[PDB]
Amino acid sequence: MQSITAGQKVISKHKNGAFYQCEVVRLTTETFYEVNFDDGSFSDNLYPEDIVSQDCLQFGPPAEGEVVQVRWTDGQVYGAKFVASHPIQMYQVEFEDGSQLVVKRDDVYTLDEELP
């Protein structure tokens, strides 16, 4: 719904798992890449740096369908095919203790709204 802007106090979950008031420090776009691995499983939220067959931070995404190699969550490298680049607007928030998270719009609540 309603837009959240930088400098707004909002309520979001801290890394400890509870909601606290925090402040939006900045709005950022995070670019996620989506790939089909060679076993046919699909990932929708690789980061550009996880493509280890090409330097996508420098040269941008692979071509759609291009064969790539990916460094995965288990630290190993696997073969894949590039599907798409998916930029998402996100919100960098900071809590009173100084910790920060980058979170999605649905994870941020305004002061007036009920929390689950």
Strands 100-103 vs 19-37: parallel, antiparallel or unpaired = unpaired
Cα separation, 43 vs 81, in Å, equals 11
List the beta strands (DSSP E) in 5-116: 9-13, 19-37, 42-46, 67-71, 77-94, 100-103
Exposure on the CB side of residue 14, measured as CA atoms within 13 A: 13
Give the rounded distance of the alpha carbon of 74 from its chain centre.
18
What's the reported resolution, in angstroms, to a tenth?
Answer: 1.7
Gaps (C–N > 2.5 Å) in the chain: which residues precede them?
none
Q: Any residues with CB less than 8 A from the CB of 75 and at least 6 apart, and which? A: none
Q: What 3-state class would DSSP assign to 32?
A: strand
Tally Cβ neighbours within 10 Å of residue 10: 20
Method of determination? X-ray
Q: CA 35, CA 20: separation in Å to the nearest integer?
A: 35
Query: Amino acid identity, residue 64?
Result: E
In degrees rounded to 5, what are phi and psi of residue 27? -100, 135
Determine how many CB atoms are found less than 10 A away from the CB of residue 73.
Answer: 9
The rounded radius of gyration (Å) of the Cα atoms in the chain is 17
**Domains by residue range for the chain, with CATH:** 32-85 (3.10.330.70)
H helical segments located in the chain:
56-59
Tokens 């998270």 belong to which residue? 101
Residue with tokens 């979170």: 103
Sign of CA dihedral 29, 97, 10, 103: positive
